[PDB]
Enzyme design. Structure first.
Site, PDB file in Angstrom:
ATOM      1  N   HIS A  60      19.306   8.961   0.668  1.00 34.40           N
ATOM      2  CA  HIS A  60      19.068   9.802   0.491  1.00 34.40           C
ATOM      3  C   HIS A  60      17.360  10.387   1.595  1.00 34.40           C
ATOM      4  N   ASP A  90      18.929  45.780   1.280  1.00 30.78           N
ATOM      5  CA  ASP A  90      19.556  44.236   1.309  1.00 30.78           C
ATOM      6  C   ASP A  90      19.111  43.503   2.557  1.00 30.78           C
ATOM      7  N   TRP A 125      19.394   7.939   8.675  1.00 29.67           N
ATOM      8  CA  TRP A 125      19.852   9.235   8.616  1.00 29.67           C
ATOM      9  C   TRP A 125      19.263  10.462  10.075  1.00 29.67           C
ATOM     10  N   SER A 153      25.620  26.403   8.502  1.00 25.65           N
ATOM     11  CA  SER A 153      24.488  27.379   7.653  1.00 25.65           C
ATOM     12  C   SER A 153      23.577  27.621   8.469  1.00 25.65           C
ATOM     13  N   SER A 154      22.346  26.530   8.258  1.00 22.38           N
ATOM     14  CA  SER A 154      20.929  27.523   8.613  1.00 22.38           C
ATOM     15  C   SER A 154      21.604  28.127   9.480  1.00 22.38           C
ATOM     16  N   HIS A 235      12.573  16.964  16.449  1.00 16.89           N
ATOM     17  CA  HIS A 235      10.994  17.532  16.137  1.00 16.89           C
ATOM     18  C   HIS A 235      10.669  18.847  15.650  1.00 16.89           C
ATOM     19  N   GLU A 237      12.556  20.243  13.886  1.00 18.85           N
ATOM     20  CA  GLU A 237      13.558  20.762  11.889  1.00 18.85           C
ATOM     21  C   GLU A 237      12.030  20.587  11.332  1.00 18.85           C
ATOM     22  N   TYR A 239       9.157  20.901  11.338  1.00 22.22           N
ATOM     23  CA  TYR A 239       8.329  22.296  11.813  1.00 22.22           C
ATOM     24  C   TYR A 239       9.357  23.535  11.021  1.00 22.22           C
ATOM     25  N   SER A 250      -0.567  30.783   1.811  1.00 25.60           N
ATOM     26  CA  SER A 250      -1.126  31.544   1.934  1.00 25.60           C
ATOM     27  C   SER A 250      -1.176  32.840   0.985  1.00 25.60           C
ATOM     28  N   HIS A 284       7.943  11.779  21.156  1.00 23.17           N
ATOM     29  CA  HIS A 284       7.095  10.946  20.751  1.00 23.17           C
ATOM     30  C   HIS A 284       7.275   9.862  19.437  1.00 23.17           C
ATOM     31  N   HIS A 285       9.046  10.394  19.668  1.00 23.80           N
ATOM     32  CA  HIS A 285       9.770   9.323  18.897  1.00 23.80           C
ATOM     33  C   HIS A 285      10.187   8.296  19.394  1.00 23.80           C
ATOM     34  N   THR A 310      -3.255  24.044  13.023  1.00 27.49           N
ATOM     35  CA  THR A 310      -3.035  23.652  11.846  1.00 27.49           C
ATOM     36  C   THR A 310      -4.481  23.597  11.469  1.00 27.49           C
ATOM     37  N   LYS A 313      -5.761  27.332  10.680  1.00 20.14           N
ATOM     38  CA  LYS A 313      -4.630  27.005   9.477  1.00 20.14           C
ATOM     39  C   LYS A 313      -4.877  26.855   7.747  1.00 20.14           C
ATOM     40  N   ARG A 432      10.689  -1.053   8.449  1.00 17.80           N
ATOM     41  CA  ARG A 432      10.379  -0.013   7.800  1.00 17.80           C
ATOM     42  C   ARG A 432      12.284  -0.339   7.915  1.00 17.80           C
TER      43      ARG A 432
HETATM   44  C1  HEA Z   1      11.635  15.924   2.099  1.00 18.92           C
HETATM   45  C2  HEA Z   1      11.523  14.802   2.278  1.00 18.92           C
HETATM   46  C3  HEA Z   1      11.520  13.489   1.323  1.00 18.92           C
HETATM   47  C4  HEA Z   1      10.911  13.426   0.134  1.00 18.92           C
HETATM   48  C5  HEA Z   1      10.297  15.073  -1.097  1.00 18.92           C
HETATM   49  C6  HEA Z   1      10.767  11.887  -0.944  1.00 18.92           C
HETATM   50  C7  HEA Z   1       9.964  11.604  -1.598  1.00 18.92           C
HETATM   51  C8  HEA Z   1      10.049  10.181  -2.021  1.00 18.92           C
HETATM   52  N1  HEA Z   1      10.425   9.118  -1.218  1.00 18.92           N
HETATM   53 FE1  HEA Z   1      11.150   8.871   0.733  1.00 18.92          FE
HETATM   54  N2  HEA Z   1      12.538   9.166   2.639  1.00 18.92           N
HETATM   55  C9  HEA Z   1      12.185  10.494   3.538  1.00 18.92           C
HETATM   56  C10 HEA Z   1      12.291  11.626   3.172  1.00 18.92           C
HETATM   57  C11 HEA Z   1      10.983  11.659   1.827  1.00 18.92           C
HETATM   58  N3  HEA Z   1      11.183  11.489   0.979  1.00 18.92           N
HETATM   59  C12 HEA Z   1      13.103   9.829   4.701  1.00 18.92           C
HETATM   60  C13 HEA Z   1      13.730  11.272   5.858  1.00 18.92           C
HETATM   61  C14 HEA Z   1      13.412   9.121   4.393  1.00 18.92           C
HETATM   62  C15 HEA Z   1      14.079   7.691   5.577  1.00 18.92           C
HETATM   63  C16 HEA Z   1      16.083   7.611   5.748  1.00 18.92           C
HETATM   64  C17 HEA Z   1      16.058   6.840   6.891  1.00 18.92           C
HETATM   65  O1  HEA Z   1      15.527   5.889   7.184  1.00 18.92           O
HETATM   66  O2  HEA Z   1      17.365   6.813   7.332  1.00 18.92           O
HETATM   67  C18 HEA Z   1      12.754   8.109   3.340  1.00 18.92           C
HETATM   68  C19 HEA Z   1      12.733   6.483   3.066  1.00 18.92           C
HETATM   69  C20 HEA Z   1      11.883   6.044   1.627  1.00 18.92           C
HETATM   70  C21 HEA Z   1      10.981   4.604   1.847  1.00 18.92           C
HETATM   71  C22 HEA Z   1      11.296   4.518   2.552  1.00 18.92           C
HETATM   72  C23 HEA Z   1      12.326   3.361   3.108  1.00 18.92           C
HETATM   73  C24 HEA Z   1      12.900   2.492   4.045  1.00 18.92           C
HETATM   74  O3  HEA Z   1      12.594   1.824   5.163  1.00 18.92           O
HETATM   75  O4  HEA Z   1      13.973   1.626   4.065  1.00 18.92           O
HETATM   76  C25 HEA Z   1      10.234   5.045   0.211  1.00 18.92           C
HETATM   77  C26 HEA Z   1       9.457   3.801   0.614  1.00 18.92           C
HETATM   78  O5  HEA Z   1       8.858   3.902  -0.279  1.00 18.92           O
HETATM   79  C27 HEA Z   1      11.069   6.214  -0.281  1.00 18.92           C
HETATM   80  C28 HEA Z   1      10.106   6.500  -1.435  1.00 18.92           C
HETATM   81  C29 HEA Z   1      10.146   8.160  -2.125  1.00 18.92           C
HETATM   82  C30 HEA Z   1       9.848   8.278  -2.798  1.00 18.92           C
HETATM   83  C31 HEA Z   1       9.108   7.248  -4.063  1.00 18.92           C
HETATM   84  C32 HEA Z   1       9.429   9.923  -3.817  1.00 18.92           C
HETATM   85  C33 HEA Z   1       8.952   9.908  -4.693  1.00 18.92           C
HETATM   86  O6  HEA Z   1       8.499  11.576  -4.207  1.00 18.92           O
HETATM   87  C34 HEA Z   1       9.506  10.894  -5.468  1.00 18.92           C
HETATM   88  C35 HEA Z   1      10.465  12.330  -5.338  1.00 18.92           C
HETATM   89  C36 HEA Z   1       9.855  13.006  -5.775  1.00 18.92           C
HETATM   90  C37 HEA Z   1       9.745  14.550  -6.012  1.00 18.92           C
HETATM   91  C38 HEA Z   1       9.072  15.042  -7.126  1.00 18.92           C
HETATM   92  C39 HEA Z   1      10.599  15.089  -4.838  1.00 18.92           C
HETATM   93  C40 HEA Z   1      11.878  15.951  -5.836  1.00 18.92           C
HETATM   94  C41 HEA Z   1      11.710  17.315  -5.766  1.00 18.92           C
HETATM   95  C42 HEA Z   1      12.081  18.121  -6.301  1.00 18.92           C
HETATM   96  C43 HEA Z   1      12.740  17.784  -7.336  1.00 18.92           C
HETATM   97  C44 HEA Z   1      11.741  19.851  -6.067  1.00 18.92           C
HETATM   98  C45 HEA Z   1      13.122  20.612  -6.227  1.00 18.92           C
HETATM   99  C46 HEA Z   1      12.878  21.748  -7.751  1.00 18.92           C
HETATM  100  C47 HEA Z   1      12.679  23.283  -7.124  1.00 18.92           C
HETATM  101  C48 HEA Z   1      13.871  23.178  -5.503  1.00 18.92           C
HETATM  102  C49 HEA Z   1      12.260  23.795  -7.977  1.00 18.92           C
HETATM  103  N4  HEA Z   1      11.552   7.187   1.093  1.00 18.92           N
HETATM  104  C1  HEA Z   2       6.595  18.056   7.317  1.00 15.65           C
HETATM  105  C2  HEA Z   2       7.216  17.180   8.147  1.00 15.65           C
HETATM  106  C3  HEA Z   2       5.683  17.198   9.500  1.00 15.65           C
HETATM  107  C4  HEA Z   2       5.068  17.261   9.916  1.00 15.65           C
HETATM  108  C5  HEA Z   2       4.389  18.705   9.909  1.00 15.65           C
HETATM  109  C6  HEA Z   2       4.623  16.473  10.417  1.00 15.65           C
HETATM  110  C7  HEA Z   2       3.611  16.732  11.476  1.00 15.65           C
HETATM  111  C8  HEA Z   2       3.014  16.088  12.702  1.00 15.65           C
HETATM  112  N1  HEA Z   2       3.600  14.910  12.799  1.00 15.65           N
HETATM  113 FE1  HEA Z   2       5.124  13.952  12.448  1.00 15.65          FE
HETATM  114  N2  HEA Z   2       6.574  13.206  11.387  1.00 15.65           N
HETATM  115  C9  HEA Z   2       8.064  13.558  10.124  1.00 15.65           C
HETATM  116  C10 HEA Z   2       7.968  14.606   9.626  1.00 15.65           C
HETATM  117  C11 HEA Z   2       6.376  15.238  10.031  1.00 15.65           C
HETATM  118  N3  HEA Z   2       5.520  15.166  11.006  1.00 15.65           N
HETATM  119  C12 HEA Z   2       9.225  12.763  10.585  1.00 15.65           C
HETATM  120  C13 HEA Z   2      10.235  12.553   8.633  1.00 15.65           C
HETATM  121  C14 HEA Z   2       8.819  11.439  10.919  1.00 15.65           C
HETATM  122  C15 HEA Z   2       9.829   9.850  10.875  1.00 15.65           C
HETATM  123  C16 HEA Z   2      11.583  10.466  11.643  1.00 15.65           C
HETATM  124  C17 HEA Z   2      11.851   9.398  11.575  1.00 15.65           C
HETATM  125  O1  HEA Z   2      11.833   8.452  12.096  1.00 15.65           O
HETATM  126  O2  HEA Z   2      12.856   9.493  10.316  1.00 15.65           O
HETATM  127  C18 HEA Z   2       7.490  11.803  11.703  1.00 15.65           C
HETATM  128  C19 HEA Z   2       7.222  10.774  13.122  1.00 15.65           C
HETATM  129  C20 HEA Z   2       5.667  11.162  13.297  1.00 15.65           C
HETATM  130  C21 HEA Z   2       5.568  10.269  14.539  1.00 15.65           C
HETATM  131  C22 HEA Z   2       7.226   9.634  15.419  1.00 15.65           C
HETATM  132  C23 HEA Z   2       6.011   8.279  14.940  1.00 15.65           C
HETATM  133  C24 HEA Z   2       6.754   7.241  14.750  1.00 15.65           C
HETATM  134  O3  HEA Z   2       8.206   6.896  14.045  1.00 15.65           O
HETATM  135  O4  HEA Z   2       7.110   5.901  15.380  1.00 15.65           O
HETATM  136  C25 HEA Z   2       4.402  10.881  15.440  1.00 15.65           C
HETATM  137  C26 HEA Z   2       3.920  10.931  16.557  1.00 15.65           C
HETATM  138  O5  HEA Z   2       3.380  11.362  17.595  1.00 15.65           O
HETATM  139  C27 HEA Z   2       3.825  12.681  14.368  1.00 15.65           C
HETATM  140  C28 HEA Z   2       2.647  12.885  14.721  1.00 15.65           C
HETATM  141  C29 HEA Z   2       2.680  14.649  14.014  1.00 15.65           C
HETATM  142  C30 HEA Z   2       1.420  15.144  14.000  1.00 15.65           C
HETATM  143  C31 HEA Z   2       0.720  14.895  15.382  1.00 15.65           C
HETATM  144  C32 HEA Z   2       1.806  16.435  13.314  1.00 15.65           C
HETATM  145  C33 HEA Z   2       0.680  17.547  13.955  1.00 15.65           C
HETATM  146  O6  HEA Z   2       1.375  18.197  13.511  1.00 15.65           O
HETATM  147  C34 HEA Z   2       0.290  17.019  12.109  1.00 15.65           C
HETATM  148  C35 HEA Z   2      -1.235  18.544  11.977  1.00 15.65           C
HETATM  149  C36 HEA Z   2      -2.203  18.190  11.397  1.00 15.65           C
HETATM  150  C37 HEA Z   2      -3.181  17.737  11.362  1.00 15.65           C
HETATM  151  C38 HEA Z   2      -3.645  16.844  12.469  1.00 15.65           C
HETATM  152  C39 HEA Z   2      -4.251  17.554  10.216  1.00 15.65           C
HETATM  153  C40 HEA Z   2      -5.026  18.931  10.131  1.00 15.65           C
HETATM  154  C41 HEA Z   2      -6.250  19.791  11.121  1.00 15.65           C
HETATM  155  C42 HEA Z   2      -7.075  19.452  10.836  1.00 15.65           C
HETATM  156  C43 HEA Z   2      -7.896  19.288   9.589  1.00 15.65           C
HETATM  157  C44 HEA Z   2      -8.457  20.070  12.355  1.00 15.65           C
HETATM  158  C45 HEA Z   2      -9.257  18.527  12.228  1.00 15.65           C
HETATM  159  C46 HEA Z   2      -7.872  17.504  13.470  1.00 15.65           C
HETATM  160  C47 HEA Z   2      -8.261  17.237  14.660  1.00 15.65           C
HETATM  161  C48 HEA Z   2      -9.845  17.535  14.921  1.00 15.65           C
HETATM  162  C49 HEA Z   2      -7.572  16.154  15.723  1.00 15.65           C
HETATM  163  N4  HEA Z   2       5.033  11.784  13.651  1.00 15.65           N
HETATM  164 CU   LIG Z   3       7.803  14.526  15.124  1.00 16.92          CU
END
Ligand code: HEA
Ligand code: HEA
Ligand SMILES: [Cu+2]
Ligand SMILES: [Mg+2]
Lengths: 504, 104, 51, 52, 85, 266, 90, 76, 50, 38
Positions: A60, A90, A125, A153-154, A235, A237, A239, A250, A284-285, A310, A313, A432
């Site tokens: 998943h 193109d 994953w 691919s990417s 990380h 990935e 962004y 935008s 930070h992970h 951010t 933005k 988790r």
């Molecule tokens: C892309 C990121 C993404 C999205 C969208 C989701 C969507 C959801 N996820 Fe999660 N989830 C993960 C990324 C995501 N997830 C990751 C990375 C893990 C960790 C796996 C690991 O530990 O190895 C995880 C694991 C995870 C857990 C933790 C399980 C565990 O710890 O064992 C849970 C629990 O509630 C959960 C639930 C859901 C639910 C209810 C949704 C709902 O939002 C259901 C989805 C609904 C949607 C609407 C999204 C589908 C979108 C479309 C169909 C749009 C496509 C359309 C076009 C292309 C035109 N997923």
């Molecule tokens: C869409 C993808 C996405 C994005 C954009 C981010 C954005 C950020 N993430 Fe995250 N992150 C994940 C996807 C993402 N992350 C995933 C998939 C995991 C789990 C991986 C796994 O183990 O499976 C994860 C886990 C993760 C960890 C590791 C925790 C752990 O696994 O133990 C941390 C730690 O620093 C982190 C922090 C942040 C921060 C600081 C930002 C920042 O970029 C966010 C910045 C935005 C804001 C802060 C809000 C906007 C700001 C304002 C409105 C101004 C006001 C703010 C201040 C005054 C401070 N996230």
């Molecule tokens: Cu991160």
């Protein structure tokens, strides 16, 4: 023959959009088994199988990360919209663009085949050794080879995108007149080219450890080295998956406000600062693996800096809506929802950056609630904002506005009631990647499993929104794809448009 | 900037422009999202009722009443019992456990 | 389990530690990765084979 | 010139330095190799068998 | 010690280190509440006051150097205020 | 067909200087060849019978598809479909591919730097491990560095020359010098007193030098293919320049490989 | 014509004309077809782009406010300025 | 390309700070204690302990006077 | 319709029986995308129950 | 008689932001946020 031998960018982008929809369907199906096992304490529909639960969460996570958001934003809207937006006839390498798409179905097939071989790849994953190495059989090799094919691919897609933006722009159009979606796709391509080969090297080391009896990550190796390489990839990935959403938001917010984007150069600089900072914050992970306190100290201090670009933005989007003439439509609600709900996903990231707080909430559902705020409500809302925006241009079909509003409200309610209770579970210490939990965690688990079914229903309702379109004639626009007919010709821009700078 | 707005409003004629923030009326939206929520609730209820292979004995009412008799109390194999989580349940610092209290 | 005990969380042999005393805990593992987490004490450190 | 000299001073010299089976030598997490028993390109195995 | 039903925040502590962690979390949440309130209130007011039934035609506002510098420099001070503890 | 060229000149060629391709079958065949070869590789890892033959079959199909794709590209070059800006874009794409291969090697050498610098208790904290006799820099590796530097300079000759005989001779000298770098790496792989299964030193040495040798072989074959297009029409265009760029990239990679593994003993 | 230094030789000038198109003297856009998309920037802002469509046989048309006027003209060849007229250097 | 606005240099100050800190952290690791490829490094107890305490105290000694005063929160 | 040289590369109002094939394809896509994980669950649990 | 481009924007200040009161709303938002945070 049209959809197998294509060299046009508009066909390959539409193939990416459909493949991303299929990946979203597969991931949504895999996500209902998770929330249906986790609805009640004890043993649910999986009959007390933990290996199968691990296989399900692994598949998943990989599918929803790589085969849904990435082909929709980067391969889907990018391939269709980039040469029209810059004025290119193109892509630069049209047959490389086809092998960029056609390496994705073999990767998805290998990933789905790994579930049916032996006991499956139950690793997560991230695929941490020695759990990945201990697995007897063949399934883990198939999953990692799927990862290799998706990465290649990417990389090839990013190569085509970067040569297209650099070398096929319209005459008179510099890197100042491109809209922000083009800038987002270009910076995404830069991040892909820099970050994916690190993952390729890490997975090659994993293959040699599994199958060649080498010593990369083993008894005599170093298991923290894999986490270093993997998160140095992983990380950037996340962004890669979020910058095209910024570009789409935008474009959408600018359109319906009847205003240009506030602070264009500030927007580009904020995107560039986010792109640069994403390569130096990766550990930070790894706060709980046993790193020295100076490393932890630096990575705590550096991760909090990403908040400032951010925030600029977000405030620039709000200033774009400010003092306009705004008409709220269905794509407009998917962008206002993006702004209001990506903020809730970023503020918890600030909390997770501080390593003292992260000692309590590492590998809990606080993390899960954070990254489902920034992905299920930042990237999915960006994908769905552009489907109701550019859909009549891309596919030729209109949509009913009432059923689209029904679908939006169902998704919005179903995601604010699935992951908002997962914050309280993680603060109270629910770990988790577990299917049987303690008896006191039952209420929020029940609420979250109630929200997931609403999400599934909104997935079903989306199929009923399409209808026939009404076609009109264009005169003027602010972007180049809104002077084209819907749908455009197979060779759109029969004459290459030029940008004339006036006497001013 | 206005002409692309008027063009998009012609290619999407079901989107209304009547002078209100929620252009689609709520009499259309509220019943359909209510029906979707009801269908989701039926699926959740079906999962709870018909899709469980082991219900834990610690959730039976006999276990629950015998647990509610005891309270938030943990036993020790080397010491008297202790009240769990003393800050949220407001145990004063003089009192450590049930048996060491010996009420006056 | 029996009433007064907690399901899932209960063990057969606990770890006995005195209070008000500086204790050194050396966390390691034998086959795969693990993590020793007790949220009351604020301790969560991963158990790595070799470290 | 030195490489053409090297091509004639190739597989003629010998080493008889047997190596004891240390834990980091000849790792066999999975039994054998995908192509056989010994390693590839290895015609003269060094690690000792029958470790006295 | 042990988690409770319908619990929102952290568990109770037995070390000074964990209480320091929880206090740091609540100090960060102090700033997060104000950030979210400002964003949500300003979004609501911008949405209601600039609907097209109120606005005859929009205004040209592409840049504002003072406000850009202000919302760049205020969050950086918050970051450095959080970081030292 | 006779009006196909007329239609192209009327609608594409006389309007912009970029190249628009007709539909092609090779991307799909290359993708499903990768599928077949991945299944064969996974079966060959775990000694499944008739698995190595399946992996070789998939790799042979990918090689044939790529060869026919590149023959089509060469045909399209010879009929004058590529202007100057198209060839500039070819060099830009080669630069992006070089950057990706560079980060692949950065990730590979990160492992050498990590594992060599801080040995662990499992190795009894001794780097290099006891028993391992490392390969010296004062020997055949120095001859390899000299030969590959000579190949760098001879490939640099053919980039700037205008006499076709000079270009052909310089390219043949570069290719023959590249072939001596690989035929001698084979002798290192035969004389070395350790295995890829012997310690992280042997692991990192063999994996990194094997990836470099594979890149040397790819660059030598690309330089060979760029020479035959010049032996026919005395013009190569982007095929000569991009092959020289890739060869210089391989040369620069060897500097880091030699200076981290052979000199630093990592 | 504007200075052709630092201009690519194939950019087809008319875009590099030294004139501000007025109502009584528009800028004549050459085209190979009856309609063509051109892009005009705001005279008060270089960052803003408005793309418009000119049609053959139409009155002068202004795209941005206080901008140039334009008239399309159907031609069989567009002077690829950079080797067409500066090689003439008339 | 374009002229960077006034925000992006306020951006570039902590970005330059972070890049410099990253370079310093990368540089100071092969000049630390456990990065020694020998068991004979630790048989000289005076130099080993001095080097390890030097690696301890750097960047921590700026925090000792507030560690001792429990400056571990924004408020008290 | 002429997709290569006509005015539109996709003319969905000119495929005969378009709305039937469109809903058939959408239904097949939903069926496969929502039923492949259930088959994988059934396949692994049928191997243990042997 | 030619085709004229229409007036598309007001200047910032004489349209529908003269009655917004930006600083007042920012002060109200900061007051509410600070009250909740306190
Ligand atoms: C892309 C990121 C993404 C999205 C969208 C989701 C969507 C959801 N996820 Fe999660 N989830 C993960 C990324 C995501 N997830 C990751 C990375 C893990 C960790 C796996 C690991 O530990 O190895 C995880 C694991 C995870 C857990 C933790 C399980 C565990 O710890 O064992 C849970 C629990 O509630 C959960 C639930 C859901 C639910 C209810 C949704 C709902 O939002 C259901 C989805 C609904 C949607 C609407 C999204 C589908 C979108 C479309 C169909 C749009 C496509 C359309 C076009 C292309 C035109 N997923
Ligand atoms: C869409 C993808 C996405 C994005 C954009 C981010 C954005 C950020 N993430 Fe995250 N992150 C994940 C996807 C993402 N992350 C995933 C998939 C995991 C789990 C991986 C796994 O183990 O499976 C994860 C886990 C993760 C960890 C590791 C925790 C752990 O696994 O133990 C941390 C730690 O620093 C982190 C922090 C942040 C921060 C600081 C930002 C920042 O970029 C966010 C910045 C935005 C804001 C802060 C809000 C906007 C700001 C304002 C409105 C101004 C006001 C703010 C201040 C005054 C401070 N996230
Ligand atoms: Cu991160
Ligand atoms: Mg973890």
């Amino acid at each position: 023959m049209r959809w197998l031998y294509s060299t046009s960018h508009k066909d390959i982008g539409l193939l990416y959009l459909v493949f991303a929809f299929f990946g979203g369907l597969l991931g949504t199906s895999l996500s209902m088994l998770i929330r249906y096992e986790l609805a009640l304490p004890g043993r649910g529909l999986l009959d007390g199988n933990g290996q199968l639960y691990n296989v399900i969460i692994t598949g998943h996570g990989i599918i929803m990360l790589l085969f849904m958001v990435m082909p929709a934003l980067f391969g889907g809207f990018g391939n269709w919209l980039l040469p029209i937006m810059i004025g290119a006839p193109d892509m630069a390498f049209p047959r490389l663009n086809n092998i960029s798409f056609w390496l994705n179905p073999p990767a998805l097939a290998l990933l789905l085949l790994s579930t049916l071989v032996e006991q499956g790849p139950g690793t997560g994953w991230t695929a941490y050794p020695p759990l990945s190495v201990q697995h007897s059989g063949t399934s883990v090799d198939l999953a990692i080879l799927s990862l290799h094919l998706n990465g290649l691919s990417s990389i090839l897609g990013a190569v085509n995108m970067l040569v297209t933006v650099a070398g096929l722009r319209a005459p008179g159009m510099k890197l100042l007149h491109m809209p922000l979606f083009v800038w987002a796709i270009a910076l995404t391509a830069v991040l892909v080219i820099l970050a994916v080969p690190v993952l390729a090297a890490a997975l090659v080391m994993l293959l040699t450890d599994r199958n060649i009896n080498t010593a990369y990550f083993c008894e005599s190796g170093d298991l923290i080295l894999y986490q270093h390489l993997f998160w140095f990839f992983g990380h950037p990935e996340v962004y890669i998956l979020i910058l095209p959403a910024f570009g789409i938001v935008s474009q959408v917010v600018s359109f319906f406000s009847q205003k240009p984007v506030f602070g264009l150069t500030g927007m580009i600089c904020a995107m560039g600062a986010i792109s640069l900072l994403g390569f130096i914050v990766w550990a930070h992970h790894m706060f709980t693996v046993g790193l020295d306190l100076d490393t932890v100290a630096y990575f705590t201090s550096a991760t909090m800096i990403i908040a400032v670009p951010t925030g600029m933005k977000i405030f620039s989007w709000m200033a774009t809506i400010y003092s306009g003439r705004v008409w709220f439509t269905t794509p407009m609600w998917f962008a206002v929802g993006f702004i209001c709900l990506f903020t809730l996903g970023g503020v918890t990231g600030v909390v997770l950056a501080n390593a003292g707080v992260d000692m309590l909430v590492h590998d809990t559902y606080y993390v899960v609630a954070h990254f489902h705020y920034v992905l299920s409500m930042g990237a999915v809302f960006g994908i769905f904002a552009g489907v109701y925006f550019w859909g009549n241009l891309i596919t030729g079909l209109g949509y009913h506005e009432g059923r689209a509003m029904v679908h939006f409200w169902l998704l919005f309610i179903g995601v604010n009631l699935t992951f908002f209770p997962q914050h309280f579970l993680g603060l109270a210490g629910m770990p988790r990647r577990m299917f049987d939990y303690a008896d006191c965690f039952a209420g929020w688990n029940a609420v979250s499993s109630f929200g997931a079914s609403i999400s599934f229903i909104s997935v079903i309702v989306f199929a009923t929104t399409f209808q026939e379109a009404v076609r009109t004639v264009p005169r003027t626009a602010t972007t180049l794809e809104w002077v084209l007919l819907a749908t455009p010709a197979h060779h759109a821009l029969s004459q290459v448009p030029v940008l004339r700078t006036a006497s001013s | 900037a206005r002409a692309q707005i008027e063009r998009w409003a012609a290619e999407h004629p079901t989107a209304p422009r009547v002078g209100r923030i929620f252009e689609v009326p709520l009499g259309y939206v509220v019943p359909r999202v209510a029906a979707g929520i009801a269908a989701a609730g039926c699926l959740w209820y079906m999962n709870n009722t018909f899709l469980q292979t082991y219900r834990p004995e610690s959730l039976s009412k006999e276990f629950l009443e015998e647990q509610a008799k005891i309270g938030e109390v943990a036993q020790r194999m080397n010491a008297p019992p202790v009240y769990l989580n003393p800050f949220t349940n407001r145990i004063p610092g003089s009192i450590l456990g049930p048996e060491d209290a010996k009420p006056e | 389990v029996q009433p007064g005990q907690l399901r899932v969380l209960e063990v057969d042999e606990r770890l006995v530690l005195p209070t008000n005393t500086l204790i050194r805990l050396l966390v390691t593992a034998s086959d795969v990765l693990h993590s020793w987490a007790v949220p009351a004490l604020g301790v969560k450190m991963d158990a790595v084979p070799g470290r | 010139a030195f490489m053409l000299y090297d091509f004639a001073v190739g597989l003629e010299e010998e080493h008889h330095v047997t190596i004891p089976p240390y834990p980091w030598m000849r790792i066999r997490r999975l039994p054998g190799m995908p192509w056989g028993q010994d390693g590839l390109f290895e015609g003269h195995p060094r690690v000792a068998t029958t470790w006295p | 010690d042990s988690p409770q039903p319908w619990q929102l925040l952290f568990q109770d502590t037995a070390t000074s280190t964990a209480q320091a962690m929880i206090d740091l979390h609540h100090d960060i949440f102090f700033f997060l509440i104000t950030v979210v309130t400002l964003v949500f209130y300003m979004m609501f007011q911008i949405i209601t006051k600039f609907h097209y039934s109120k606005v005859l035609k929009p205004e040209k506002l592409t840049h504002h150097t003072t406000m850009e510098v202000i919302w760049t420099i205020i969050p950086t001070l918050i970051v450095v205020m959080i970081a030292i503890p | 067909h006779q009006t196909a060229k007329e239609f192209y000149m009327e609608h594409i060629g006389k309007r912009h200087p970029f190249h628009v391709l007709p539909p092609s079958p090779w991307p799909m065949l290359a993708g499903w060849g990768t599928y077949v070869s991945c299944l064969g590789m996974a079966a060959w890892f775990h000694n499944m019978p008739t698995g190595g033959a399946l992996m070789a079959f998939g790799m042979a199909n990918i090689a044939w598809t790529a060869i026919t794709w590149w023959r089509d590209c060469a045909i399209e070059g010879d009929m004058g479909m590529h202007t100057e800006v198209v060839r500039k874009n070819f060099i830009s794409g080669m630069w992006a591919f070089i950057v990706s291969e560079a980060l692949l090697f950065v990730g590979l050498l990160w492992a050498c730097l990590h594992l060599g610098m801080s040995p662990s208790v499992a190795l009894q904290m001794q780097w290099p491990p006891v028993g391992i006799e490392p390969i010296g820099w004062d020997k055949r590796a120095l001859v390899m560095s000299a030969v590959l530097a000579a190949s760098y300079y001879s490939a640099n000759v053919a980039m700037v020359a205008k006499d076709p005989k000079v270009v052909m001779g310089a390219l043949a000298t570069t290719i023959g010098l590249g072939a001596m770098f690989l035929a001698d790496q084979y002798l290192e792989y035969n004389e070395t007193p350790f295995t890829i299964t012997d310690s992280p030193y042997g692991t990192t040495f063999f994996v990194t030098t094997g990836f470099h040798g594979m890149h040397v072989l790819l660059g030598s074959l690309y330089l060979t293919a760029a020479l035959m297009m010049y032996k026919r029409t005395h013009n190569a265009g982007a095929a000569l320049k991009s092959s020289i760029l890739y060869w210089h990239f391989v040369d620069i990679v060897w500097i880091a490989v030699y200076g981290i593994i052979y000199v630093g003993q990592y | 014509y504007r200075p052709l230094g630092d201009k690519e030789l194939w950019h087809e000038a008319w875009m590099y004309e030294d004139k501000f198109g007025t109502e009584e003297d528009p800028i004549i856009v050459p085209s190979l077809e009856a309609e063509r998309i051109i892009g005009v920037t705001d005279p008060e802002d270089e960052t803003l782009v408005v793309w418009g469509i000119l049609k053959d046989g139409e009155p002068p048309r202004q795209f941005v406010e206080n901008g140039e006027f334009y008239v399309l003209k159907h031609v069989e060849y567009i002077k690829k300025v950079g080797d067409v007229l500066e090689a003439i250097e008339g | 390309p374009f002229k960077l606005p006034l925000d992006a240099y306020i951006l570039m100050l902590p970005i330059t700070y972070a890049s410099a800190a990253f370079v310093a952290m990368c540089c100071r690791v092969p000049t630390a204690d456990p990065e020694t490829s020998s068991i004979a490094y630790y048989e000289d107890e005076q130099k080993s302990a001095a080097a390890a305490q030097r690696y301890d105290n750097s960047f921590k000694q700026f925090f000792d006077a507030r560690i001792r005063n429990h400056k571990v929160g924004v408020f008290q | 319709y002429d997709f290569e040289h006509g005015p539109h590369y996709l003319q969905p109002e000119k495929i005969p029986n378009f709305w039937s094939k469109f809903y058939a394809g959408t239904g097949a896509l939903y069926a496969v995308g929502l039923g492949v994980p259930l088959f994988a669950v059934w396949w692994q649990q049928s191997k243990l129950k042997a | 008689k030619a085709v004229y481009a229409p007036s598309e924007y007001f200047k910032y200040g004489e349209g529908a932001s003269k009655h917004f009161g930006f600083a007042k709303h920012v002060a109200i938002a900061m007051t509410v946020g600070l009250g909740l945070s306190f």
